[PDB]
Amino acid sequence: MIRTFETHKIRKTAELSSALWNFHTIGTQGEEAVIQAPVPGCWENYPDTVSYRGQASYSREFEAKGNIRLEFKGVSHTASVLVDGKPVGSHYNAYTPFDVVLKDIRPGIHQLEVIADNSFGPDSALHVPNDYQSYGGISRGVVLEELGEAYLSWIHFTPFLRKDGWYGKAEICVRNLSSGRLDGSVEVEIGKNSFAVLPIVLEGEEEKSFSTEELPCPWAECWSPESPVLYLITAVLRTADGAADDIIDRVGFREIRTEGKDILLNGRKLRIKGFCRHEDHPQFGCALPFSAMQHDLMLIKDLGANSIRTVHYPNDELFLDLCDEQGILVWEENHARGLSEENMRNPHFKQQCGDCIREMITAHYNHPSIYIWGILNECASDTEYGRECYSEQYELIKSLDPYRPRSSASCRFKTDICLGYPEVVSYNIYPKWYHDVPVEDYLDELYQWIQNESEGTGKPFLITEIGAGAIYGYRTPAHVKWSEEYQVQALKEQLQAVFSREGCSGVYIWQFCDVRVCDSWFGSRPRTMNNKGIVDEYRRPKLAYEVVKDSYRSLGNYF
Amino acid sequence: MIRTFETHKIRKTAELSSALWNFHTIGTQGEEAVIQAPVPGCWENYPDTVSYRGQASYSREFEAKGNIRLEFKGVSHTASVLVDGKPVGSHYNAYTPFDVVLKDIRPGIHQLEVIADNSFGPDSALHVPNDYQSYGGISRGVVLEELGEAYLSWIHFTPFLRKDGWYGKAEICVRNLSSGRLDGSVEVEIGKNSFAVLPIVLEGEEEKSFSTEELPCPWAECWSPESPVLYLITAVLRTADDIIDRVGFREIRTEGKDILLNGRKLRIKGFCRHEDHPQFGCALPFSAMQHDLMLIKDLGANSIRTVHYPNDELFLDLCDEQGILVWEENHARGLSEENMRNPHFKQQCGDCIREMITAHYNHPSIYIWGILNECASDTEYGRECYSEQYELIKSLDPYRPRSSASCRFKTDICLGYPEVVSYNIYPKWYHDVPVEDYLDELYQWIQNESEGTGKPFLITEIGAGAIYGYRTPAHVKWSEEYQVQALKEQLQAVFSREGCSGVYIWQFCDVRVCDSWFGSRPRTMNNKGIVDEYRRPKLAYEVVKDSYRSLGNYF
Amino acid sequence: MIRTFETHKIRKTAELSSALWNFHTIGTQGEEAVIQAPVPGCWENYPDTVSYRGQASYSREFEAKGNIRLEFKGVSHTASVLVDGKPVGSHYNAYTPFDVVLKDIRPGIHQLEVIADNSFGPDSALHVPNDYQSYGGISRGVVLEELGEAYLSWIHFTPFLRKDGWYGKAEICVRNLSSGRLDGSVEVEIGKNSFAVLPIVLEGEEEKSFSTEELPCPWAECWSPESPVLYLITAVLRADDIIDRVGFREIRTEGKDILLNGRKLRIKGFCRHEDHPQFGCALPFSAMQHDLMLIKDLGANSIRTVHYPNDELFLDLCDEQGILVWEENHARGLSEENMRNPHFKQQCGDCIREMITAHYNHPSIYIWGILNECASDTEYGRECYSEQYELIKSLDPYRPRSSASCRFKTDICLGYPEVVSYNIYPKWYHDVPVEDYLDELYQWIQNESEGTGKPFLITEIGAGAIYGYRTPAHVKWSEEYQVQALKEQLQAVFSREGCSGVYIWQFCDVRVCDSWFGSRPRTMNNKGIVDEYRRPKLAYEVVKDSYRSLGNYF
Ligand SMILES: O=C(O)[C@H]1O[C@H](O)[C@H](O)[C@@H](O)[C@H]1O
Ligand SMILES: O=C(O)[C@H]1O[C@H](O)[C@H](O)[C@@H](O)[C@H]1O
Ligand SMILES: O=C(O)[C@H]1O[C@H](O)[C@H](O)[C@@H](O)[C@H]1O
Ligand SMILES: [Cl-]
Numbered sequence A: 001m002i003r004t005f006e007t008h009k010i011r012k013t014a015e016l017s018s019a020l021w022n023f024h025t026i027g028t029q030g031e032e033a034v035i036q037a038p039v040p041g042c043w044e045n046y047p048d049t050v051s052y053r054g055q056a057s058y059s060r061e062f063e064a065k066g067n068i069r070l071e072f073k074g075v076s077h078t079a080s081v082l083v084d085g086k087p088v089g090s091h092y093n094a095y096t097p098f099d100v101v102l103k104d105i106r107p108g109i110h111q112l113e114v115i116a117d118n119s120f121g122p123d124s125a126l127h128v129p130n131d132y133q134s135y136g137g138i139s140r141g142v143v144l145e146e147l148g149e150a151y152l153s154w155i156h157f158t159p160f161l162r163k164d165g166w167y168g169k170a171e172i173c174v175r176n177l178s179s180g181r182l183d184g185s186v187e188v189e190i191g192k193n194s195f196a197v198l199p200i201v202l203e204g205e206e207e208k209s210f211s212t213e214e215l216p217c218p219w220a221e222c223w224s225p226e227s228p229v230l231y232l233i234t235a236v237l238r239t240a241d242g243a244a245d246d247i248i249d250r251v252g253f254r255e256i257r258t259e260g261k262d263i264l265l266n267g268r269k270l271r272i273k274g275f276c277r278h279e280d281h282p283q284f285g286c287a288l289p290f291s292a293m294q295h296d297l298m299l300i301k302d303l304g305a306n307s308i309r310t311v312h313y314p315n316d317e318l319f320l321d322l323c324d325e326q327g328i329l330v331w332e333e334n335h336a337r338g339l340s341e342e343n344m345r346n347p348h349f350k351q352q353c354g355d356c357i358r359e360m361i362t363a364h365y366n367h368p369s370i371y372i373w374g375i376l377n378e379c380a381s382d383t384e385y386g387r388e389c390y391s392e393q394y395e396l397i398k399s400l401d402p403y404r405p406r407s408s409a410s411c412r413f414k415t416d417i418c419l420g421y422p423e424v425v426s427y428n429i430y431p432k433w434y435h436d437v438p439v440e441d442y443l444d445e446l447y448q449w450i451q452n453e454s455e456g457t458g459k460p461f462l463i464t465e466i467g468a469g470a471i472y473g474y475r476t477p478a479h480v481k482w483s484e485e486y487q488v489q490a491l492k493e494q495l496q497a498v499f500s501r502e503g504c505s506g507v508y509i510w511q512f513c514d515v516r517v518c519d520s521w522f523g524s525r526p527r528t529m530n531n532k533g534i535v536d537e538y539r540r541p542k543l544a545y546e547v548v549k550d551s552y553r554s555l556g557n558y559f
Numbered sequence B: 001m002i003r004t005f006e007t008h009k010i011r012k013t014a015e016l017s018s019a020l021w022n023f024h025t026i027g028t029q030g031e032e033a034v035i036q037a038p039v040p041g042c043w044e045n046y047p048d049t050v051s052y053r054g055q056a057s058y059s060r061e062f063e064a065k066g067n068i069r070l071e072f073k074g075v076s077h078t079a080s081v082l083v084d085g086k087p088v089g090s091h092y093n094a095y096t097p098f099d100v101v102l103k104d105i106r107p108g109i110h111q112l113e114v115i116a117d118n119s120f121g122p123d124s125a126l127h128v129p130n131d132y133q134s135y136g137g138i139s140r141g142v143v144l145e146e147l148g149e150a151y152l153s154w155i156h157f158t159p160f161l162r163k164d165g166w167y168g169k170a171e172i173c174v175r176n177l178s179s180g181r182l183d184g185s186v187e188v189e190i191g192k193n194s195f196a197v198l199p200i201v202l203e204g205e206e207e208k209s210f211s212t213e214e215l216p217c218p219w220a221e222c223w224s225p226e227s228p229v230l231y232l233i234t235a236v237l238r239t240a241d242d243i244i245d246r247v248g249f250r251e252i253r254t255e256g257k258d259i260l261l262n263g264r265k266l267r268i269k270g271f272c273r274h275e276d277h278p279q280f281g282c283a284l285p286f287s288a289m290q291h292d293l294m295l296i297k298d299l300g301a302n303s304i305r306t307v308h309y310p311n312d313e314l315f316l317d318l319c320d321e322q323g324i325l326v327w328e329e330n331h332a333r334g335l336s337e338e339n340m341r342n343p344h345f346k347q348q349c350g351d352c353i354r355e356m357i358t359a360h361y362n363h364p365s366i367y368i369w370g371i372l373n374e375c376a377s378d379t380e381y382g383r384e385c386y387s388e389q390y391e392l393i394k395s396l397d398p399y400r401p402r403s404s405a406s407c408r409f410k411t412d413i414c415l416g417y418p419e420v421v422s423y424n425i426y427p428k429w430y431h432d433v434p435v436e437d438y439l440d441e442l443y444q445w446i447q448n449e450s451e452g453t454g455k456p457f458l459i460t461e462i463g464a465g466a467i468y469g470y471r472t473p474a475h476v477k478w479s480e481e482y483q484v485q486a487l488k489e490q491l492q493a494v495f496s497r498e499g500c501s502g503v504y505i506w507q508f509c510d511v512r513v514c515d516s517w518f519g520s521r522p523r524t525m526n527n528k529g530i531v532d533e534y535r536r537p538k539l540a541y542e543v544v545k546d547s548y549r550s551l552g553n554y555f
Numbered sequence C: 001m002i003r004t005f006e007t008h009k010i011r012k013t014a015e016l017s018s019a020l021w022n023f024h025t026i027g028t029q030g031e032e033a034v035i036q037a038p039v040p041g042c043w044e045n046y047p048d049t050v051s052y053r054g055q056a057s058y059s060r061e062f063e064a065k066g067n068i069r070l071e072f073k074g075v076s077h078t079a080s081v082l083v084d085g086k087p088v089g090s091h092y093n094a095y096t097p098f099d100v101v102l103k104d105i106r107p108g109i110h111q112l113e114v115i116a117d118n119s120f121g122p123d124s125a126l127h128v129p130n131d132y133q134s135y136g137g138i139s140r141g142v143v144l145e146e147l148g149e150a151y152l153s154w155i156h157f158t159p160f161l162r163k164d165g166w167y168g169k170a171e172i173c174v175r176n177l178s179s180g181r182l183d184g185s186v187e188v189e190i191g192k193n194s195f196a197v198l199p200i201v202l203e204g205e206e207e208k209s210f211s212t213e214e215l216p217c218p219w220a221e222c223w224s225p226e227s228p229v230l231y232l233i234t235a236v237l238r239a240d241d242i243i244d245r246v247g248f249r250e251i252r253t254e255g256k257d258i259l260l261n262g263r264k265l266r267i268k269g270f271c272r273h274e275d276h277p278q279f280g281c282a283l284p285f286s287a288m289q290h291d292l293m294l295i296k297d298l299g300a301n302s303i304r305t306v307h308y309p310n311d312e313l314f315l316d317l318c319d320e321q322g323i324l325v326w327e328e329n330h331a332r333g334l335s336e337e338n339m340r341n342p343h344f345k346q347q348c349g350d351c352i353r354e355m356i357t358a359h360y361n362h363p364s365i366y367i368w369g370i371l372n373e374c375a376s377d378t379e380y381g382r383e384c385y386s387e388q389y390e391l392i393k394s395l396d397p398y399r400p401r402s403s404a405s406c407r408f409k410t411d412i413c414l415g416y417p418e419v420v421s422y423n424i425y426p427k428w429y430h431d432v433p434v435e436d437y438l439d440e441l442y443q444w445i446q447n448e449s450e451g452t453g454k455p456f457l458i459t460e461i462g463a464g465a466i467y468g469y470r471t472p473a474h475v476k477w478s479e480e481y482q483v484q485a486l487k488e489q490l491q492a493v494f495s496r497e498g499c500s501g502v503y504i505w506q507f508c509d510v511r512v513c514d515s516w517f518g519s520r521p522r523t524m525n526n527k528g529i530v531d532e533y534r535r536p537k538l539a540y541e542v543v544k545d546s547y548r549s550l551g552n553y554f
């Protein structure tokens, strides 16, 4: 399973994940026995490599002929792909998909091999020792596609809420694999309503994007938390062959807009009742199956949340599909957490950030659940060099998506110099956990400073992180910190304060569940875990579960 | 995902599971909220139905035209299927697959609804209050198939090991949905080798089976735990339809006290494993299953026993591919004589055996068929039921051996029937007898005073409780250190017991049970796992791994 | 520490406990290591004997001359005492005190050895495999007393509440260790008020008791939960003394009422075993008070001593804090056949005799219990209940008596006690609504039993919970289920017309016997409101809300 829906009926495709591959470590001075191992999966979950860091090899066979495409939804975190023993592609960043295109391969059985690598080092500026694990392995799915002469790379649909109703445009990208000129047509339908026909002329080996006008969609019903209506959009490449290729995605008609201090969904003023959620599970690493995803979402919905924040990297497209279908709002951000100014000066940092953003928005553009793009969680936005990166990455996002609001979760308390750029100002604060200041006092001081002393003034404002730690099981009448009883007190006051802060659009609690972290963080991280889950790593509700549930269920999605 | 491989390239099929359906409980007078629930799944894992027992409705839409088949891999435990508001199908038993066939439906969008029921009462003779959970919901997958005039119902392949090498016969069942006579052909290949072309004749609306002969397979490599080579077998109906399954070339038979796999004397290093998980109920995804199997391989085990019911075919697929030997039994546990006298018992055991063996016939990992775990094999009425079910199996699968797990310590009157004698025993957990002494007294009784004398012998259950996290220097029962003492002695005795073929540890993980069993079941769990319900290893995990890993697959 | 107050100022005494003795197990052929072990203590808390059941030896030396007395407050459960190598004394039962008296021993250093034994078998009718632990060792204190020619063996003070106010009578037992006739006086004071001077005549080696008359005590303030005023009572033999503490309080039943100083009492109680993961049944002063402070924090006003007499230092603390005590002889759940053990009646009568003689003066003890959940539905059992009730009345004619029954509508012994008491477990062992279960049982007692019209207590109600096991399914053994159960249970008992109150089963989790493992997760009884480490379970708040919303009287 790759999506909750079929993205192709014309194109010949086959999933090569949901299978056992042969797995062995490489580059050790140990026995490198070959085992059978699941794809998707992480090798920290296989008994023999439970604390392995480095390189390992995944291999299987496939049968194909002609032009083919190999799509990897995620490889943790550095990949080398080899077909029949020849290097054919490479990738960095565990959380975005990439592909390999191979022209006119001999028929029959072929050998596929993926070297996955989760080493830390100078070549890796995003995956570093951090307050979340960098797993290893083929953590999301793999798809083999047999292509014709030319194929559809992506389709991007934008709805528009005009005075007279719903409009929309579509942009399609076509890649000519043939050395000759290509003439054809792309016909677009949305939900079996006729939309557009884009005539196609492509030179040899050219990839080109084509756009429709802004067209009426009087038949469209809107997407919202209360009514998450989705339509299948289908684009068909027609050439002298015939219906040669297709691409199918899903869209929701919804408008996300900022106006003053208001985040507006379909004209209504939005209240965020959110959770920060990592892709982490003690059996599945970051390769969580559909059943584990939906189990998280039912707990999150049971807590009364309307939104998730993808800390701190793009998410599996299966998960975003599930959020589309259930009306869950998504803050999605590029892969970065707490990188210093010196980390951002790594020779690869800008290129790696650029590649993450490009793949994230190119692949995830159509998800109506995504309402905001985040960047550079808690990076050095108080420095001049830090500002330079923020500026570039913000404007990279505008060039890819000129319509969704942008933001970045900050912790430079009253020293941020990058608040002028984004549409939404966002802050991570931990009064009552890391600081013994009353939550109301701390939040008021920060908020006045943003309104009076920063270029963030007048913009909508979110607390993108607040919460407290607690070790499940540890309970004492002393209510000391790390006890479940103290987490209850902390969250009750924290949620009371954010929901009472005039000008604040809501909150993401840090965080949904407990998370495995890197070993170097053990000094401040009991159990080598981040312990601020409202549910523990096995999804057992802590005492604070009821406190969060009482808060979130007592408020609606709108102001 | 339904199988680890594609079962169709010609038949038009689409998975209707791996999706959210609309869900609500039924049996009340007001508004019940409609929630979006995962299929496959158990409603005990949905926050608002965590302890619900009764009926509930699952529903979605699909697009289809003409003759269609809806295949349900598992609905826990009683199902009613309605298409476009009309009841079209029924099933009992949570653990066997079943299908609905509809002729010439109008084109377009249709409404599908499943009423799932996990209630207890007189209608249900297999799902009772018991020492495992009877979940509710669409706990395995659902497949839409668009059919034509006729379709291949199943295909059964049987390998035969002769003095000159491998042989095999195939038997195909074809169903004619047309009221006229059908003429056609069925082309069978195994691993892209030409096997047979059978001409077919079916009268109107008839279902008939057709067999090849025993043909030579000089190309076949064998299947074993060391080398689980598999082949795809393909059957194409030309009249337009196909069916694809997987086979291994391997021989299971008993001879004297020996269980022989390809003529080698087999040693079972097993775990009893329930389909139970704290997040997934009995509806475990591919990822969870492989996680269990990797732990089980890490423990040195070479076999699993499917306590106490048939298993997901995706799980059997994974065992085939990895060389894991499988004891699969019909759904029954610990039924007394009076439970077995329920007017539905014989029908429901018979339906379970027929659907189990017909659907699973080809898995090379399945080496034995079990029946009626700890049922009333000490009574005449019980013996009557054992006899019927043993002969039902022989009619469906005349080659694999049969057994049953007994707890009728020196009182069983049914040991003459099976190919293998199996006993569940718990010395050093329920009785403070030394294991060697308890197992010796049992073993000499079967041999000197029972009709099971001279047959192969397994310990199908042995083990001890341990609540994860409870440890004391006193080594009291339920402490993890006591499970260590108990499992060492237990495994040492079984592997040293002359005539015993091996052992299934009770059990792999901790398992949720029914509330009525709470009094003897701490946490309303079975705590005899070597890993707890969250798959964390107890202290005894090391003891089992040192034992199993010191031993190979054969004597 | 033996009591919270000094019991002698004239008598020469020294505590031999609060020390390390030499300890080794016996019953083997080789060399057993000798270790320095604590007395008081249980060997199940010593690392090398954590599961030891059998005999063991405890020994130390002492210095003494002349007539001496060795008082042993508790040896679990069968004791043999040797001085200088010679068998001098025997006891059975872990929970009652006993003494050895030695006439004119040579002066100097002496060897004392105690052989303790916690074996189960035919010689033991009370200590059996059961739903609590039979520990081994010198689990309570030990006192050396150096005596003269006679000594005061005990003193019993009884208050009487009359129209004009408080009266009292005292009874004193003097033991003559001399072979000749003895003459003297006994001078008794209560709270430095003059009380009585009794002239004493004892023949040779005679033990005789002497009674004062009922005398006015117009200075006496009364004892109660609200005001636990205590007085020291002093009896001086003229050469020897004995001191004890009394409270002026009247316990009475009248109709369906239990009256404490005329006020209708409401019991808000806990069953509490003498059990601690570190200290076995040998809990120090500090651990007792920690239990008592949690018990007061929960809003309770009473404890029930399941299922045996308690340390006198614990009883002392209950006197000082106004905690009402139900004390019972040592027995739990013996069947008719267990009761037909040939030592059963001897060992019950010894327990009742040692219990009431030692504890008579504790004003906190308001009722005497017997034979918890024994065979009160059989004729042989009713024979035993009958005997033990009348023995109690012969030793204590004034406090009410009872027994905790589980013979739900089959008890034939309800005619005997002053108070009818039942242990019931609806919503734990039976899925009946508590009010319906309690109403069915109550109407039967009123309409169909000889217990009709008498005061009525629920002496056990509660539910299991393994600390730390929590789930949204609220299954049994989860802490969330124990919350639900106790809420309904306490709602029902406190609303049951005719019911005087409740003892929750039980305060804390308790180690039990290995044979009970099948129904006892962790080989523990998990029905505590705190766990064995005194950590509060979720249901702690439920009990607190219930008990703190109710006073001590109706
Ligand atoms: O302290 C914490 O737990 C958090 O601190 C920051 O807010 C960071 O963004 C998180 O990743 C997490 O580490
Ligand atoms: O006691 C136990 O745990 C077991 O007893 C029997 O052996 C039964 O077959 C098991 O299902 C389980 O109930
Ligand atoms: O079930 C229980 O825990 C209780 O049963 C009886 O009421 C008995 O008096 C208690 O000692 C305890 O065993
Ligand atoms: Cl933390």
Ligand SMILES: [Cl-]
Residues within 6 Å of the ligand: B465, B520, B521, B522, B525, B526, B527, B528
């Ligand atoms: Cl168990």
Ligand SMILES: [Cl-]
Residues within 6 Å of the ligand: C464, C519, C520, C521, C524, C525, C526, C527
């Ligand atoms: Cl218990």
